[PDB]
Design an enzyme around this catalytic site. Structure first.
Site, PDB file in Angstrom:
ATOM      1  N   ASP A 162      10.681  -5.184   6.731  1.00 27.24           N
ATOM      2  CA  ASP A 162      10.046  -4.049   6.434  1.00 27.24           C
ATOM      3  C   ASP A 162      10.607  -3.173   5.281  1.00 27.24           C
ATOM      4  O   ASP A 162      11.716  -3.759   4.946  1.00 27.24           O
ATOM      5  CB  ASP A 162      10.030  -3.330   7.741  1.00 27.24           C
ATOM      6  CG  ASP A 162       8.991  -2.253   7.872  1.00 27.24           C
ATOM      7  OD1 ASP A 162       8.200  -2.198   6.755  1.00 27.24           O
ATOM      8  OD2 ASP A 162       8.878  -1.322   8.735  1.00 27.24           O
ATOM      9  N   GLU A 163       9.916  -2.585   4.873  1.00 25.05           N
ATOM     10  CA  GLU A 163      10.257  -1.578   3.766  1.00 25.05           C
ATOM     11  C   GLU A 163      11.178  -2.242   2.583  1.00 25.05           C
ATOM     12  O   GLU A 163      12.174  -1.861   2.305  1.00 25.05           O
ATOM     13  CB  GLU A 163      11.238  -0.298   4.186  1.00 25.05           C
ATOM     14  CG  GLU A 163      10.775   0.412   5.531  1.00 25.05           C
ATOM     15  CD  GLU A 163       9.611   1.221   5.381  1.00 25.05           C
ATOM     16  OE1 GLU A 163       9.422   1.603   4.108  1.00 25.05           O
ATOM     17  OE2 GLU A 163       9.088   1.520   6.226  1.00 25.05           O
ATOM     18  N   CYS A 195      -7.644   9.930   1.581  1.00 30.47           N
ATOM     19  CA  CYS A 195      -7.114  11.265   1.088  1.00 30.47           C
ATOM     20  C   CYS A 195      -7.141  12.275   1.856  1.00 30.47           C
ATOM     21  O   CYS A 195      -8.155  12.807   2.787  1.00 30.47           O
ATOM     22  CB  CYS A 195      -8.242  11.300  -0.195  1.00 30.47           C
ATOM     23  SG  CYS A 195      -7.569  12.609  -1.250  1.00 30.47           S
ATOM     24  N   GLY A 223       0.764  -1.121  -0.057  1.00 32.53           N
ATOM     25  CA  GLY A 223      -0.040  -0.086  -0.187  1.00 32.53           C
ATOM     26  C   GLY A 223       0.802   1.228   0.001  1.00 32.53           C
ATOM     27  O   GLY A 223       1.987   0.974   0.018  1.00 32.53           O
ATOM     28  N   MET A 236       2.501   5.033   0.943  1.00 31.29           N
ATOM     29  CA  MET A 236       3.342   5.471   2.124  1.00 31.29           C
ATOM     30  C   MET A 236       2.681   5.770   3.350  1.00 31.29           C
ATOM     31  O   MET A 236       3.142   5.571   4.512  1.00 31.29           O
ATOM     32  CB  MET A 236       3.886   6.776   1.833  1.00 31.29           C
ATOM     33  CG  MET A 236       4.956   7.519   2.747  1.00 31.29           C
ATOM     34  SD  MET A 236       5.952   8.756   1.780  1.00 31.29           S
ATOM     35  CE  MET A 236       7.039   7.881   0.580  1.00 31.29           C
ATOM     36  N   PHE A 237       1.333   6.388   3.420  1.00 29.67           N
ATOM     37  CA  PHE A 237       0.691   6.719   4.639  1.00 29.67           C
ATOM     38  C   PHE A 237      -0.487   5.618   5.121  1.00 29.67           C
ATOM     39  O   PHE A 237      -1.214   5.982   5.882  1.00 29.67           O
ATOM     40  CB  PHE A 237      -0.043   7.939   4.640  1.00 29.67           C
ATOM     41  CG  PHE A 237       1.070   9.148   4.443  1.00 29.67           C
ATOM     42  CD1 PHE A 237       1.715   9.521   5.535  1.00 29.67           C
ATOM     43  CD2 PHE A 237       1.626   9.486   3.036  1.00 29.67           C
ATOM     44  CE1 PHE A 237       2.706  10.516   5.539  1.00 29.67           C
ATOM     45  CE2 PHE A 237       2.530  10.558   3.018  1.00 29.67           C
ATOM     46  CZ  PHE A 237       3.243  11.122   4.181  1.00 29.67           C
ATOM     47  N   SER A 238      -0.228   4.402   4.607  1.00 33.46           N
ATOM     48  CA  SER A 238      -1.457   3.306   4.864  1.00 33.46           C
ATOM     49  C   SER A 238      -1.113   2.631   6.055  1.00 33.46           C
ATOM     50  O   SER A 238      -2.011   1.500   6.445  1.00 33.46           O
ATOM     51  CB  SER A 238      -1.238   2.294   3.606  1.00 33.46           C
ATOM     52  OG  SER A 238      -0.074   1.586   3.492  1.00 33.46           O
ATOM     53  N   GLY A 239      -0.025   2.825   6.899  1.00 36.41           N
ATOM     54  CA  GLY A 239       0.337   1.869   8.061  1.00 36.41           C
ATOM     55  C   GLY A 239       0.959   0.501   7.960  1.00 36.41           C
ATOM     56  O   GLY A 239       0.766  -0.232   8.695  1.00 36.41           O
ATOM     57  N   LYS A 240       1.402   0.325   6.770  1.00 37.42           N
ATOM     58  CA  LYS A 240       2.245  -1.078   6.399  1.00 37.42           C
ATOM     59  C   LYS A 240       3.010  -1.410   7.514  1.00 37.42           C
ATOM     60  O   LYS A 240       2.953  -2.785   7.943  1.00 37.42           O
ATOM     61  CB  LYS A 240       2.962  -0.878   5.099  1.00 37.42           C
ATOM     62  CG  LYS A 240       2.313  -0.605   4.022  1.00 37.42           C
ATOM     63  CD  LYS A 240       3.063  -0.639   2.626  1.00 37.42           C
ATOM     64  CE  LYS A 240       4.159   0.287   2.805  1.00 37.42           C
ATOM     65  NZ  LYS A 240       3.810   1.505   2.794  1.00 37.42           N
TER      66      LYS A 240
END
Ligand code: ZN
Ligand code: ZN
Ligand code: ZN
Ligand code: ZN
EC number: 2.7.1.21
Lengths: 175, 175, 175, 175
Positions: B71-72, B128, B9, B11-15
C-alpha cells in the site's frame, strides 16, 4: 472541459484498433475528430494526419476539433506529454495509444508519464502464442531464438519475428 | 506464474480500500496473504506488516505467501520496482496501490514505471467536491486558497486541507 | 441527471465492499449518501437504512439525497427495477449490488434486467478455493459433497458451506 | 476450460468492432477463431459464418475451434443461451456481442440472461449526439420527432433515423 484517455499494452493487444473504436464514437455524435500518427458516417469522417515530429501537432488549427487521437505515442519523446496536457487543458478530449514496454520488458518512454497524468488508463492484453493465456509481453525472436538483452532494434539481414507471450513464456537472453 | 496488479488514482479515490478488497478474495480462497504498509475468515487472515524501507520486504520469508499487497507505494523510491518485479518473477501475485500524481498534478514516483510494467492497471477516480463530476486530482488548500506550485509538503502552523477535484476545478497557484 | 451503476458477481467477490467504496467517494465530495440493505468524514456519513420490502424505499424522503446505494438486490423482486429506474430518472446516482447467479449457476432475479438497463455494469470475480484461478461461481456443499440441482435453500441440521469456485471446479449434482 | 465474455451497449457503442478486436487477438496467438453473424495474419484468419437460426451453430464442426464469436445476439432468442453455455462447458472461449436495450429503453432478450451467466461483461457507451456526454441509449426518430412507445419496428415509407443519446436527452413519446 477536456481530459486524457490512455490506451496501452503490448504489440499485439489491438491498441490502435481500440483507439479507432473510441474515435468513431465521436463521429456518430457528430463531433469533429482527428487522429495523428507517425509518418466516415453521414459526411463526418476521422481526419487522419501523418506526422514526423510531436511539435507538428501544434502547427495545425485544432480550435474546432472535439476529439484528438494520437497513435503509436512511443514514437515520440517526452515533448508529447506537455502537448497532450495543453490540448486537454484547452478543452479537447485527447486519446493516446502506445506501447507500455519494449521487447526487453523495459518501460517505453513516454507512456509511463502519460499513464500517471491521464484521467483514464486502459491496459489491453493479448493472448500468449505459446499457451493461450492472457499475455502482457512481446517476444522478439532472432534466428529462431529469444533476442538478447543488448540486441539493437535495427538489423541487416536477420531473420526476426515478434509474437505475444505471457510473462512465463517471455525470455530475454543474457548479453 | 506470478503477475503485478497496479491500483492508482488520487488521494480520495479509495485505492487502499480496493487493495484490501482484492486481498480478501485471497483469504476466501484459502490463500496466504500479506500486505506491506509504510510505518480474517475461518482462521485465515491478512498478515499486515509495517515497514519504513522497501528493502525490508526481502528480509521476510515469503516462500509460502500466495498474494503480496503493498500500500501507499509512492512512499518508497524506485527500488520498490525491481522488488515487485522479482516477487512476481518468483511466482507471487503482487498488488500495489499508490498515488498517480501529487497536489501539483506532477507524477508521483515510482507509480509511472510500475504502471508501465504491470500486467493490470486500474486508475480509480473520486468525485469532485466542487461540482460532483468524476475527479482525477487532489486540491491542496492553504489558508483557504489553492497551494502554490512551490509550496513545501511540510509546514508549521498552516491551516491546510485536501479535497478531490476534477481538472476543471483543480488550481495550482503561481510561484 | 441521474444514472444507475450495477455491481455484480459471486458470493465471495466483494460486491458489498465495492458498493461501500463507491459510496464513500460521495462522502469525500460532501454529498449526501444513503444505502438501503435487507433487514463518516468531517461530519458527513453514509446513512444506512434496513428494509424488508423494496416499496419501503419510496416512503423515505430522498429529495436532498445525491447518491443512493442498494445492497444485496437479489433479496428483492422485480419491483426494485422500476424503483431504481424512477430514482435515476429523478436525478439520483443509484448504485446497486447483488448476486448474478445462485449456487446452481442460475441467474438471480432481478439482476439480469438491472444489468440490461444500467449505464454501468461491473462484474467482480473471486478466487477459486480449489485452484486459485479467477472464479465466477459459488459452490454449495452439503455434508462434504456438491449440492444437488433440486436441493432447497433452507435446511434443518445439515452441514453446509459455500466457497468460490471457477466453472471448471463448480459441480451441481444430479437430482 | 472455457468461459463466456459478454460485450453489450447501445447501437452506436462499437460492440461489433470490440468483438472483432478480441477475436483478432486469437489470430495473433495462432488460435483457430470463428465468428457467427445473423444472415488474417500469417495464413490464420477469422472464419466468418452467416446464420439465420441459433441452432445452425451446432451443425458446424467446432471441435478444433479455440475462440467462438457471436455478433448481434439480440437477433436470436433464448435458445442461444444454452448453446453458449454448452460451448463454454465444452472448453471454448465464447465471446458474445449484442444490444442491451431497444429504442424504448426496454431490455433486449436474451442479453440479460447472458450477462447474468457470463464470466466477463463489458458494457460500452457511445457519445451523446446532443450534448457530447457519455450515452447509454439509442434515440429513434420518425419524421423528425421521438418515436412513440408503441411504434412498430418495421414501417413503410417513414423518414426515420437513430442516434446515440444520454438518458437526459433520450425521449420516448407517449402512445
Ligand atoms: Zn504463455
Ligand atoms: Zn469539478
Ligand atoms: Zn478452480
Ligand atoms: Zn446528452
Amino acid at each position: 472541459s477536456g481530459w486524457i484517455e490512455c490506451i496501452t499494452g503490448s504489440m499485439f493487444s489491438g491498441k490502435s484498433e481500440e483507439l479507432i473504436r473510441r474515435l468513431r464514437r465521436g463521429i456518430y455524435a457528430k463531433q469533429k475528430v482527428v487522429v495523428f500518427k507517425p509518418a466516415s458516417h453521414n459526411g463526418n469522417a476521422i481526419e487522419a494526419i501523418n506526422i514526423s515530429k510531436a511539435s507538428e501537432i501544434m502547427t495545425h488549427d485544432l480550435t474546432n476539433v472535439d476529439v484528438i487521437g494520437i497513435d503509436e505515442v512511443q514514437f515520440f519523446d517526452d515533448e508529447i506529454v506537455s502537448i497532450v496536457e495543453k490540448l486537454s487543458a484547452d478543452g479537447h478530449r485527447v486519446i493516446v495509444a502506445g506501447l507500455d514496454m519494449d521487447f526487453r520488458g523495459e518501460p517505453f518512454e513516454p507512456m509511463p508519464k502519460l499513464m500517471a497524468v491521464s484521467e483514464q488508463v486502459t491496459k489491453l492484453q493479448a493472448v500468449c502464442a505459446v499457451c493461450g493465456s492472457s499475455s502482457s509481453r512481446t517476444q522478439r525472436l532472432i534466428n529462431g531464438k529469444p533476442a538478447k538483452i543488448d540486441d539493437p532494434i535495427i538489423l541487416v539481414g536477420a531473420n526476426e519475428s515478434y509474437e505475444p507471450r505471457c510473462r512465463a513464456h517471455h525470455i530475454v537472453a543474457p548479453s
